Design an enzyme around this catalytic site. Sequence first.
Site, PDB file in Angstrom:
ATOM      1  CB  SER A 150      -2.092 -44.149 -30.815  1.00  0.00           C
ATOM      2  OG  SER A 150      -2.373 -44.462 -29.464  1.00  0.00           O
ATOM      3  N   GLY A 173      -3.474 -39.670 -34.389  1.00  0.00           N
ATOM      4  CA  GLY A 173      -3.397 -38.216 -34.317  1.00  0.00           C
ATOM      5  C   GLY A 173      -4.478 -37.437 -35.036  1.00  0.00           C
ATOM      6  CE  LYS A 174     -10.490 -40.032 -33.416  1.00  0.00           C
ATOM      7  NZ  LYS A 174      -9.648 -41.020 -32.676  1.00  0.00           N
ATOM      8  CB  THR A 175      -7.464 -35.173 -31.299  1.00  0.00           C
ATOM      9  OG1 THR A 175      -8.272 -36.331 -31.073  1.00  0.00           O
ATOM     10  CG2 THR A 175      -8.001 -34.005 -30.480  1.00  0.00           C
ATOM     11  CD  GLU A 225     -11.673 -39.483 -25.836  1.00  0.00           C
ATOM     12  OE1 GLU A 225     -11.049 -39.122 -26.862  1.00  0.00           O
ATOM     13  OE2 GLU A 225     -11.810 -40.683 -25.507  1.00  0.00           O
ATOM     14  NE  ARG A 232      -4.052 -32.412 -28.005  1.00  0.00           N
ATOM     15  CZ  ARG A 232      -4.137 -33.614 -28.577  1.00  0.00           C
ATOM     16  NH1 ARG A 232      -3.746 -34.703 -27.922  1.00  0.00           N
ATOM     17  NH2 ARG A 232      -4.616 -33.729 -29.810  1.00  0.00           N
ATOM     18  N   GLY A 269     -21.401 -47.213 -40.686  1.00  0.00           N
ATOM     19  CA  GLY A 269     -22.139 -46.320 -41.592  1.00  0.00           C
ATOM     20  C   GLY A 269     -23.515 -45.882 -41.116  1.00  0.00           C
ATOM     21  CE  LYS A 320     -18.816 -39.538 -51.126  1.00  0.00           C
ATOM     22  NZ  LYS A 320     -20.093 -40.008 -50.531  1.00  0.00           N
ATOM     23  CD  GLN A 321     -11.668 -33.303 -52.958  1.00  0.00           C
ATOM     24  OE1 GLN A 321     -11.668 -32.191 -52.426  1.00  0.00           O
ATOM     25  NE2 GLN A 321     -10.558 -33.891 -53.393  1.00  0.00           N
TER      26      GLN A 321
END
Lengths: 420, 374, 420, 374, 420
Positions: A206, A208-210, A234, A243, A370, A397-398
């Site tokens: 919910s 909003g990663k997609t 999915e 979308r 992990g 992380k970068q």
Amino acid sequence: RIPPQSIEAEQAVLGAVFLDPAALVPASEILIPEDFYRAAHQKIFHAMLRVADRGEPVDLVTVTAELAASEQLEEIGGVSYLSELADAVPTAANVEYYARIVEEKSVLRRLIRTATSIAQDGYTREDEIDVLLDEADRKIMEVSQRKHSGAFKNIKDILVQTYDNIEMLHNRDGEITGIPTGFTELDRMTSGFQRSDLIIVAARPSVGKTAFALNIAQNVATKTNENVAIFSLEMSAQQLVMRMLCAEGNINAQNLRTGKLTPEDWGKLTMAMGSLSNAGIYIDDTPSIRVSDIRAKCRRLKQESGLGMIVIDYLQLIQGSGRRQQEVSEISRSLKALARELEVPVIALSQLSRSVEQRRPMMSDIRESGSIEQDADIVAFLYRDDYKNIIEIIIAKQRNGPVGTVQLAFIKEYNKFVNL
Amino acid sequence: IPPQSIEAEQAVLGAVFLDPAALVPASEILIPEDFYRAAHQKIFHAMLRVADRGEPVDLVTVTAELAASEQLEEIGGVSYLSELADAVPTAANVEYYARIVEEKSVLRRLIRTATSIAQDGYTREDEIDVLLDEADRKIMEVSQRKHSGAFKNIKDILVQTYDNIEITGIPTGFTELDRMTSGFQRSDLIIVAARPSVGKTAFALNIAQNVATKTNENVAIFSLEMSAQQLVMRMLCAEGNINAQNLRTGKLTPEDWGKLTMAMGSLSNAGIYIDDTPSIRVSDIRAKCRRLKQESGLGMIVIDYLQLIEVSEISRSLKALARELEVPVIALSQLDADIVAFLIIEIIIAKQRNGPVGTVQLAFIKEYNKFVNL
Amino acid sequence: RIPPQSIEAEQAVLGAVFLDPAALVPASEILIPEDFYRAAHQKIFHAMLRVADRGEPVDLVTVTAELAASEQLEEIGGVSYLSELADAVPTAANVEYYARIVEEKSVLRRLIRTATSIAQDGYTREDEIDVLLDEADRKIMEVSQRKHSGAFKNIKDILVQTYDNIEMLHNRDGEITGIPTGFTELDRMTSGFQRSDLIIVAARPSVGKTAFALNIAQNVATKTNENVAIFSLEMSAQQLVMRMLCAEGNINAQNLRTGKLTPEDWGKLTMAMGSLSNAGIYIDDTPSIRVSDIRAKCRRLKQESGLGMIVIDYLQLIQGSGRRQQEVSEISRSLKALARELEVPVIALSQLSRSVEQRRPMMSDIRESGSIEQDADIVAFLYRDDYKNIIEIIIAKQRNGPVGTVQLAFIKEYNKFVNL
Amino acid sequence: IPPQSIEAEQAVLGAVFLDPAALVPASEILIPEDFYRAAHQKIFHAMLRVADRGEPVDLVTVTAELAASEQLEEIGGVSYLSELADAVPTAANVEYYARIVEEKSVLRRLIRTATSIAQDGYTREDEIDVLLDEADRKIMEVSQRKHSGAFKNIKDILVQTYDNIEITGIPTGFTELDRMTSGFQRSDLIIVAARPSVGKTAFALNIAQNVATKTNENVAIFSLEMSAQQLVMRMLCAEGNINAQNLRTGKLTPEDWGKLTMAMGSLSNAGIYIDDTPSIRVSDIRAKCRRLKQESGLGMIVIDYLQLIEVSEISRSLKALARELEVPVIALSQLDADIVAFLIIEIIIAKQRNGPVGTVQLAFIKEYNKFVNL
Amino acid sequence: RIPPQSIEAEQAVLGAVFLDPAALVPASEILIPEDFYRAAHQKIFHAMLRVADRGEPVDLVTVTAELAASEQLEEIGGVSYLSELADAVPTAANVEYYARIVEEKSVLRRLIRTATSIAQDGYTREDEIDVLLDEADRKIMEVSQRKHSGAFKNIKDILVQTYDNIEMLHNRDGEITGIPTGFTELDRMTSGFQRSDLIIVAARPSVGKTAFALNIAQNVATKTNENVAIFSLEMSAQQLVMRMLCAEGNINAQNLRTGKLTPEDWGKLTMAMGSLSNAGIYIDDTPSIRVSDIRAKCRRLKQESGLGMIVIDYLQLIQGSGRRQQEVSEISRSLKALARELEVPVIALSQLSRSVEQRRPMMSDIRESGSIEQDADIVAFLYRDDYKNIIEIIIAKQRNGPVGTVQLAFIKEYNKFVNL
């Protein structure tokens, strides 16, 4: 018998030192001569340490000399033997791992030795008992406090890293060395998503990663001359194009879901299609692909039309090599290899455990899923402050560049992320 | 030859036949399993099984009991029972003989535990860390204990009860909390329990700061959820009243810059030792803490939190560490212990060995993750 | 084979009669001659019974004479044999238990005999069947109705005991032969708690058994010159002193729990401490002691300073000799032995099962947690009528003295019990 | 040699092959396990398995069925099936032959049960009381039964239904309850169920009193919760309207004294036999009750309550005791039976073999533990 | 080995054809010659089919001739052998069942053959694989599609049956050939309940199946000169007479349940009893009888007084021959045999599964409790439209006569069903 040992690992430790003198530092940190089960190896490690303490270079010659002077050369097998050790090391850089194996087997020998000793005392002194139980307590604890632990990182040193981070976040100028995202503020930090990088975007359902990944894929394909490969496991190909049509031309999503379409909302749709048709977007909506399939398809694509990005709609849906803890690690590792092979940034969406709610996501929330943490050179979290239609993009992380929070606004009606 | 005393055993069973009252003191000190010989084991069990019915214990009732459960012959028959009954000249020293039997039993258990550990050293190789932990545990479990023999006179408790209302330890930085503890005493194991977002980690950090920047004491913090980087970010954020959102999202105003250079100069003087290794073992805590004290000094130990390190062992092992390093240990928990403290926020205390049991109250600023006085 | 038997028990029964002629009454009640597996024992028991029916004394001589006249002496082994039986009895008073063992083994032989008989009839008569099943029903039931049961106690006899109780409850005067409780009405009945007595005070949680025991311990130590040993296994030594400070000087408990202390409530506290310091109160707040530890500590105390009472804050917390049904019995038995040894009343608090609510507590409520009923020479229940701050103290058992309900008032604010 | 009839068995299977209809009457009287020979057992099972599909039963379908489940050879092959089919001259007497097979089966079961009990007499010694109870039960479980063969004519039921609305047993002391029962009839098992505090024990005692002091009948009460002392205390407390609190707390007023001497003179004339032994067995009830009747007389039997004496066995065994002593038995229960009665309090009756099913109403005085009429 | 086969069944199939030429039609539908494991049987079946295709009669002579002309007589064992086949058939009418057994064993041989073939190809061709897996898929499916299935019943044919039903429902006149029910509308359809018929009346609890059966039993006994035998397994004899007294004289049931009885409601009761005493009603209220007991009692009754109907208050309470799925089938089958023996209609009440609510009851609701469907020559469901005190009687099955819904009214107060 036989006493826990690893002659092979002992041989690789000493060998490593003979191939790279720097290998002695990690080895001496983890081991003392007595950890070696074989007497010759003890004598040899001791000779190395002595040479080292004099500030003299440790190599085959000075160790040979040292052992000759202490009358131990022949006893340990001679120069010929130092040669064999040098051939017994698969890779000098792996010396810590070899060292740990030696140490482990030493600790076990001490466990066995002290346990036996306690058993023996049980039959003999019989006598006291209360002292016996106490020293049995005491002696067993002593075995654990032996292994090379530590150290604590000091606050001064972290403050330096912390301040140097704040430097990078402001020193942020300004060229986009990688693939531009379309979100100028995310591009400042990343620069933007770069070739060979494995980028993990984790978020609770919910959040909003997609939509985030699609916006990026959409910006890359429509704005830049690059091809994007999207794997949606999915969500179907049409359900996903729906979308990005909405996002493109500013069409109310729920409006499309119900047929309702204002005359000009329709004209809005034809421009979206027109502009979206020129884009290099390739979608595979196979329900649960293996990584080999993903890899093979991307492989053919790069040499057939060229490839710029790979986006995978959540990683926990990819099925393993067989027909989940260890399985996900291999997939992770494989996606990083995918990035390196095709010299392309790979964006793999990830779902977060229900720990965020048990407290703003952090590394430990994907650490229970992990070891994606290690393989990813960039891990990003999406967090909404109000669960202000504003959403946070925490770059946890970068590898090359800063760590911080970039902020974007989400528009529900169009399923979009916009600048700020 | 396994430690044993057939003679002691024989006197105990014999004493019971000579005077049935002798079973009570023996039953206090022994269980059937303590007897090295099965025969005696079987007999002592029969003896107890009759007393529990509760019928008189004598040669006839015991014989009948062993025979009924088909083991009269295995224990030597009525001959043996009579031998035991006829040998015993007294039953006045039953507990002397009982205690000898008990000791030999303990020594056998000691031997059995140690042999097992020795044998596991060859067979599981494979599981070093699990082996060392369970060997610690297994040895601890050989010895009970006991409770020496000291009644507390009321006079002595009264002084401690009076003085327990109207700062001898380590100052927390919260005056109202220092009242209830005065402050964090050496060798105490302090458990701070809480629910999602209050927040446990913020509270732990605050105390770690207020101890380390105001006292010359070194704190050792073990964070298993957030990294040392994130932990220090929160600390200087609270230290100098800096809005977290500004540190994270690059852009800092010059109030923040001056406010920052202040907070990390102030934080550089501490006093803070962090370990953010994911899953740590209690013993790994000890190794790093022992090497720290012996090289630098300390201390106070802050752990966030304890269900990331069966909890009973961890808890007990933490108390030993506190008592070993003569230093207070605060362990957080999510919803044997010296002080138990649950969580404008209210700090409820449920347990304190010497101090007053009551409730304290503190404020919490959301934007700085800081707790402050009223 | 071999047929269930107990020659040892048979020998002890006949032996008992030869040591104490009174032993024949209990034996004849439980056994007839045919219960003895050994023919000689039947003949002997029969001779005893015959002598007894003539109103003649049953001993070695008259049994010898009887058997000589029936020509059975040599056949049963002679006078020498009657001697051996006399040496085969561990204790004549245990004759009922020996008798029961003989009876048990006789009943089993009849079970085996009739069962076999049924099996045989199954192969033979084959024939009728319906009659067979009915007589098989009939014959099996007959085995059970054989054992010595009964008898019913008649109402007339109980009315006598009932009336004699009412006599004692009014005939109550007036000397305190034991340790005064401070609750004059409880002292009338008890007189008060006496040396060597095991006193069990059971009550459901929230009723106030702990407060009751502390009040008694407090009254004994502050009023009389005696020492009280308190074992608190659920509550710390300071937490318990807090409760008796309040009780002593009349200080509101909740008031102390919250720091609040009116200037003179403080002066109230100093007088409580002053008076309470002179008292001989020894507290052991060890979480779960064994009885041996309790016993050893009390032992040292009586010979070091003298001892008058032992109070144990609930018995179900005492851990057994090992590392619960049978275990509690031994503890019970051990506490009674503790009382006898130190010639001191032992007050052991007990918790009641959740049966009271399934109906005013009675014996069966601790009977499911027994056999504390047997060992206790005095069992008391605490019951509150309104779950009027008045609480009832039901004395359900008292070996020397009456049975009834003594009534006291409870003051929540001070955690006290006062007279009425 | 175990009771058997190979010839009867052979005719049954043979009859089925000769006329498939014969399986129905045989299947009514027999199950495969009743056949002494496995072969026949296997065959009869195959036979039933085909009928259930439901296909015609004949040599081919049965052969195919046995072969499919790999047991044609074990039963003797098609030879044997044909032998059985060719031997049978008729199928008119299948149930005659079926009933012979059934009988032999019962006798084997009788033998097996008895042998087992005989063997248990040596092996469990140890468990006498448990052994006697389960031997009673095991033998009872050998015999079914049957239901002779008597239809009830409507004429006969009508009279009993008419007379069942407009005191032939033992008077309860409650006129309105005596209406619904008139009163407590011989050989009836009466169950009185209830919830905490109503109360079951008070009700049981009241009836035990009102029967024993008004009739020359002797009641046998078995109380498993409260002692005979407590039980008599409640009785004279209700008998003479005496406040319980005054009997308990010594002090009695002179209304109570005169009121007491009245109640126990009145209660001395009964009529009451109590047994307060904690955990009693149903058979122990019988022994004491049989010895009481044969020496004194009785009766009525009151039990408080039945889940302190698997309940099915106890219940059934109680009905046998009632029918044996020709006396009513009232057993209480906490929330096969002749009368079922649940509990200003309302007595709801759910079951009565001959009487009217309805509801009665009684009052209850809290201070005397007494039930009274309206 | 050995390959699945049934020589016995093969022999019975061919035998059947020789006893009744009509047996070849069902056999040829289910089998082709190659299904026979034995070569002689193939040759024989093939000869039969050839003769049949010529429209020539298939018997021992023409099959003999056919085989002689194809030179196969001796090879298959001669005329003598055709004789043996004729003696190898228990009943020619059972030919389909024999045929199915042969077919089953043929299908298994094909399963074994193709499976083996796949295994072999696995070792050989190694080579292609993708083709291998596909043809392995293909070949295994082919084994199933071989068995004789079908056919679909065509709508035209059902429409005919449907219309012919509507004919019977209106063509309904008018004589009562069986036992009159008292419900004239149910009598139109049934005519009424007839001798030897097994009648099953199923209904969910609270619908009124018990009241329905009692009303019928009551109408038969009071109106006609016939005897009714009622088995009530859940309800006592008096409890059931109570319900038919109410029904008879119009007495409010709840009124009786509470003693209340208006002076004339009492006069109402005496007339009910008077009239009900002359009726031939025999009730057995044995809790859980076996069918043999039921049967024996009815048997004695018919030859002692005469019998006209049997009513059993629900069938799922009848206990089996032992001490439930297969068990109920035998009871069902036994009740039908009971009906035939005593030449009397048997009304067995049945309870319905909780499927009606998962949707008006249908056959599948007792099909999960079958196979009562087969044995019953008449299955009736009771359904109330409002769960108008009107209740529906759905006659779902009737062997001789129509299928439809008869409607009656239920009066709660008297527990009766009345006409309409």
